[PDB]
Paper text:
Ctf18-RFC belongs to the RFC family of AAA+ ATPase clamp loaders, which are involved in the loading and unloading of clamps onto dsDNA. Compared to other clamp loaders, Ctf18-RFC contains two additional subunits, Ctf8 and Dcc1, which bind to the C-terminus of Ctf18 to form the Ctf18-1-8 module. Mutations in Ctf18 that disrupt formation of this Ctf18-1-8 module result in similar but not identical phenotypes as entire deletions of Ctf18 (29,30), suggesting that this module is critical for at least some of the specialized functions of Ctf18-RFC. It has been shown that the Ctf18-1-8 module binds the N-terminal catalytic domain of Pol2 (30,31), the largest subunit of the leading strand Pol ϵ, and that this interaction increases the clamp loader activity of Ctf18-RFC.
We next investigated the mechanism by which the large interaction interface could adapt to the conformational changes of Pol2CAT that would occur during DNA synthesis. As we were unable to solve a DNA-bound structure of the complex, we instead obtained clear insight into how the interaction behaves in different Pol2CAT conformations by refining a second lower-resolution (5.8 Å) cryo-EM class (Class 2). In Class 2, while the majority of Pol2CAT remains in the same position, Pol2THUMB has undergone a small movement. To maintain simultaneous interaction at all three patches despite this movement, the entirety of Ctf18-1-8 has rotated. While the central highly specific interface is unchanged, the Dcc1WH3–Pol2EXO interaction is completely altered. This plasticity can be explained by the non-specific and electrostatic nature of this interface. We show this is achieved through an unusual protein–protein mechanism that utilizes flexible electrostatic interfaces to enable high binding plasticity.
Residue numbers in the entry:
A (entry chain A): 31 to 89, 112 to 212, 242 to 539, 548 to 689, 752 to 1057, 1064 to 1112, 1136 to 1186
B (entry chain E): 715 to 740
C (entry chain D): 2 to 133
D (entry chain B): 2 to 242, 247 to 380
Write the structure that this text describes.
Amino acid sequence: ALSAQQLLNASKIDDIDSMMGFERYVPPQYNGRFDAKDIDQIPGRVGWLTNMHATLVSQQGISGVDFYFLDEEGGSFKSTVVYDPYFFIACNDESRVNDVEELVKKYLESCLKSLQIIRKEDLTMDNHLLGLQKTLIKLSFVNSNQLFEARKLLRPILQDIREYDVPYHVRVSIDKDIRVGKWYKVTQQGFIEDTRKIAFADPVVMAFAIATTKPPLKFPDSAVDQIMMISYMIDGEGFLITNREIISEDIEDFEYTPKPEYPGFFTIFNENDEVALLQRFFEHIRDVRPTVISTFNGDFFDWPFIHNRSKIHGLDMFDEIGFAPDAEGEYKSSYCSHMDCFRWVKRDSYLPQGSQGLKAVTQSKLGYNPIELDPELMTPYAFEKPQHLSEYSVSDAVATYYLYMKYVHPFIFSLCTIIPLNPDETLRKGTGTLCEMLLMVQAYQHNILLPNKHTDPILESETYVGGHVESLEAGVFRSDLKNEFKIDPSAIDELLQELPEALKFSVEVENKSSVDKVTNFEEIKNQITQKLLELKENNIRNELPLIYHVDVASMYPNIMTTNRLQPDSIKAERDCASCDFNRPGKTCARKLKWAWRGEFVSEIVEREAIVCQRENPFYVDTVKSFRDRRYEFKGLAKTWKGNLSKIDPSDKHARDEAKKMIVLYDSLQLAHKVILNSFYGYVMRKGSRWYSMEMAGITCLTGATIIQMARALVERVGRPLELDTDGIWCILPKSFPETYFFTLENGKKLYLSYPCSMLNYRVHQKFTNHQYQELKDPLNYIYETHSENTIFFEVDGPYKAMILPSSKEEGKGIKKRYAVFNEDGSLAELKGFELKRRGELQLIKNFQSDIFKVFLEGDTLEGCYSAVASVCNRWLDVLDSHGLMLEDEDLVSLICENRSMSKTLKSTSITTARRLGDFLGEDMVKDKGLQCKYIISSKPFNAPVTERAIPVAIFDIRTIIDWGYYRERLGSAIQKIITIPAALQGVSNPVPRVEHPDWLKRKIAT
Amino acid sequence: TVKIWVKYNEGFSNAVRKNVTWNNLW
Amino acid sequence: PSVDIDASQWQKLTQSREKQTTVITPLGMMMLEIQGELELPKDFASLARRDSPNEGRFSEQDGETLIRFGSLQIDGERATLFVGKKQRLLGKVTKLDVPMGIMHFNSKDNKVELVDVMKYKVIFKDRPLPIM
Amino acid sequence: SINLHSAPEYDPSYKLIQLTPELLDIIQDPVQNHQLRFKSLDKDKSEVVLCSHDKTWVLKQRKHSNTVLLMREFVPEQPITFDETLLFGLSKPYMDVVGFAKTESEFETRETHGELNLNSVPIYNGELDFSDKIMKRSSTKVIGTLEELLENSPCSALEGISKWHKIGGSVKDGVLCILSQDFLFKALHVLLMSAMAESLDLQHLNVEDTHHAVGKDIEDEFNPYTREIIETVLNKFAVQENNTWRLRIPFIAQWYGIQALRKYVSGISMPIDEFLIKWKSLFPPFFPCDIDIDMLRGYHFKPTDKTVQYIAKSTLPMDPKERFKVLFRLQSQWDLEDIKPLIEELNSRGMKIDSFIMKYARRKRLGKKTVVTSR
Ligand code: SF4
């Protein structure tokens, strides 16, 4: 009934699809032996899988799934697999399973497609550890609609649910063991992976950029505004289509090649109007048949614009190219991915939100600065500078094309080869759901029954501490300035005691070797002995430091794998009732500390929970193995690096696949890296199927204890400056034993950083789980115990300089704001600062961008503060002279303030926005991204802070500006970056208008 | 005699290569 | 259409002088490139008359009003440019990888003569500061 | 310091041209007089090229966003004193220079193959008294000399003469023309028949002896094989250096093979064996040459592996998919090395031929052959 409507849409999509080159291929019958090794004999067609979709087929329709393949020769076909949807009902009284069976048999007179008896593991159930399984009624349906009828039958009961959001395509891809990006021969027996083909085929790739009209100071609205140009690229060749009703001259053919690597020969299509550009666009697309189309925010701007003008021009986008809005309003086809780069930008690029514009991503990833043009000048230029507009357009298109190809393409395409989703879905689903689905894959393959999703609304609040952060010191520390160390000699004594085993451990556990083949064991050990004894004698010392950062490698996953931690291991009112407790020794159950934090008002209560060392291991083996596969790729990577250098430089020697391979394995190991660290965050996600607040507590407390041991050692042998969650910045004495290198007997060398190994040795002495068990023989349920610990600190440095800020408040630092400098003197990270925050004074940005690099000049503290005093005095001159010593043009640019409203108009951001709303209409401020251009005015005097911003761009500036306000805000910044660390280090105020407050002098010794 | 100055371009962009006609020159 | 390249004058001057070594050729020529827009008056004849000799910023030279619009001080590779009373630019002398050529298209007669070759350039890539 | 002056108005005639080292060296050669030339086919549409005596560059203008001021030295007529303002790091002026030009773009030069504009040049089929026929048509363009032709063509002098030799350019009865393929090769065959009739040294041919050999026993008025015709055949099928000719025997035989294809096996696909027999017998007696189909690879096609039929590459479409479509209609199965010279001119990027195909058409191999199967 409703089947047949899905069949009508399916048949329309089929017509579109066949029009685009995916005819249904049905491989030949083969009654013979399904074998994967003689794959080439079996009748069928070999293909690289690039897409797959659920479908409905007529004899009401039958549900199944279409898989889309690319052949080895650049061609295409589609083929379809059918599969029955099903879900299970669990019963609480086994004795009446037959009664439940009979009940539903009657209750589900016609909705049901089939049923069958299976057994699954229940981790809450007594004697599950001896192999007792849970018995279920599997309820199957012809399609999701029937599933939905069952859920509606069940909803009043729940008022008085299982497998309800598992995507159909995911269930088939998993059960059939299918992944996009892999190679298959499609045969009657099913899909046979061709393990001989690993290298991807080459999809059809489209990149495009549009240029549109818009009204002054408002946003484009697709009901009335028009497209003025459409530029595009197909596999690195550019095209530009022009609407000569608006663009006032014919663009001629030209070349734009911004780097030799990136040739761009552009062909021009001067079309008379909008509908013609659309039809040429659709027509060219049909000509070339792309399977990826990429955009940046095309889902919210480009595409609806296309839809509304198409409707306005009587065009049917689905009929033209098979795109239509989905339930989210996004435009999707079966055959062609919509790669809106912005989602990847926001989720995966690892950039602050202040840098999520196309410009900053271009700069970061492609490394040069394309031409930029104000839209307000773009419309006049249609008449006045059409060539300039065209130069801008192609710069846009080149950046977007190569941006996708160099970063998004390897990453997304490589990740798709292990996750059973198309690229689009991997872009859009939550990372929590991503984690959930991977674990579901792993669970299904191990016959593990899925937990239902948690659904209760958030303990109304749950904002517990996840990681521990402390700001310990602020100031500049530099390798050419000497520092005082007060060494605790008893730390050195402990270290000397640990030294034979710590260094032996370093060789054999940290380095996976054997002392037997090491040449210089005793030499190294004497050298260290001498350095520690020297430090022990002269333990109050003043000399040049080594500025180090030490950071544990993959802290929480390693905590998980070492302790075999997962949510299902939490007792949950019972353990040892059915499986034997005594023979491990702690009665089987291992108690571990966590720090619980509730919000109900906040209170911490220490709690402890028991982790059975024998529970079924399903989460952790996947993570360990995944860690090993990444390590595998690091190895493979290195082998490829050797291949990448052995060979000749004649790039046309059929090794551009090898460089792609190199890139590929790089991509694969980092894709595995991101998947690895997301396994921790899943356990705190809302609606998690594997919810454990306890697990989060255990992770934070364990990491806090390891890192507190490390800070307490460095604090006894050097000076830690700042600690955030997993990193420690410290200074060590130059006489402190540092890096050495053991030589192996084969001549190979093993790297040794002695501070990292001394800490890792202590972590392994104190935090090893000696109770780690593992099924050695599952039939008899005998566990074997051993010692596991894969937690290792690594060290970076020593560095050229380090600068840490302080708060304006007493005894308080500022977290998630710091400056760090590389050995070469360059800036490594800027976190948290006003530069990153939305809405900041450009003058302040220009200030900070000037000041940071100037702290590396000079040999002393006073000279550096004098040089920064001088740049401050330049800035004091611009603001104290109210800009008079300055040309009139440079002034207006610097003072503008722009602010986003986090809500709707219905703060300083609010008042400017409100006034823009009132003046240009509430529609201006009903939406986000309103350009609020404002200054904080001197006037009205005596008015409150929320009234202080009145928009003035909307309207003498030197008397309107609250110059004292802007110099005070910059002063605040000057305080945080320059004067207050100077103040806490006892240097008298090099920027005198910001005075040392009393608290910091008192705070410090003086 | 005091209103002569330079409006600074923040960076450098090099435009698209273009064909040349005789009329582009003449 | 078609026309030969005239390079005789440049060649004769070139042969008697050494190859270009520094930023200025033995014939005394130079180029200039600025990362920015030169904000100039819309008129020129009128402002040269209010120019005083002490200032000498808008001089009159051979009946043509030349403006002394700034100063360039060349120190080795380093160069600094002060413009007017309110602008200061810090820069460098860079040697051209490809010696460019300036020439002269006599549009009147459609004749082309090679004028000169340049091997160095004086660039100012940083935002101007006041001369103080 | 240097005192900086600016003219109020720059001459836009001064423009910047990229001078590569080779261009500079050529430029710094006082020996050359008119060896460098700006050239263009027309004034409003065609590209303008830069040609040396033997090389050609295509011009590309490239705009930049900076202010570039060209200056040169001037002697200020009257002493002027500078306002010293808050100028630090600023010394006494020791030169005055004035900016006389302001250029906004650079002209990039890329080496390219010069080509002839063969717009108004007619085809000659061997008609007697052709001067009358050139006035029977309305061809306003007159080509007295090749230099005039070359001057209004986008190519270098040497490139022009080479192409002229390549296309078999001539002049008949005082009117420049291009011989039809049929009449050119027929005149060639008769010429070679005279060449074997007069026992000339094929490695040291000159114009006079050969012209005399052709027109020995025929009246000059009815002898179209003039000396200019002789010079054309020598410049087409032989190589000069006085300057004497030596025959490119495998090349001539290849031409002859193409001609044979056009006369006898164009409308029908003969098996290769019989056509080679007749072909072999078609030569003037005792001509030393053997044969292989690879010598005519790119000039014929094979419906099956053992048959041949003529195809002209010129007749193939410019667009790859169209060209492949008609190529596959002509021959279901192509050899990769056989199909490359028919598409070589479309092979602009120079890469692997299979990747070039994979944008439009797709490949499918067999044992020794690698074929392409468009859908
Ligand atoms: S603690 Fe051990 S004995 Fe007890 S239930 Fe857990 S695994 Fe079994």
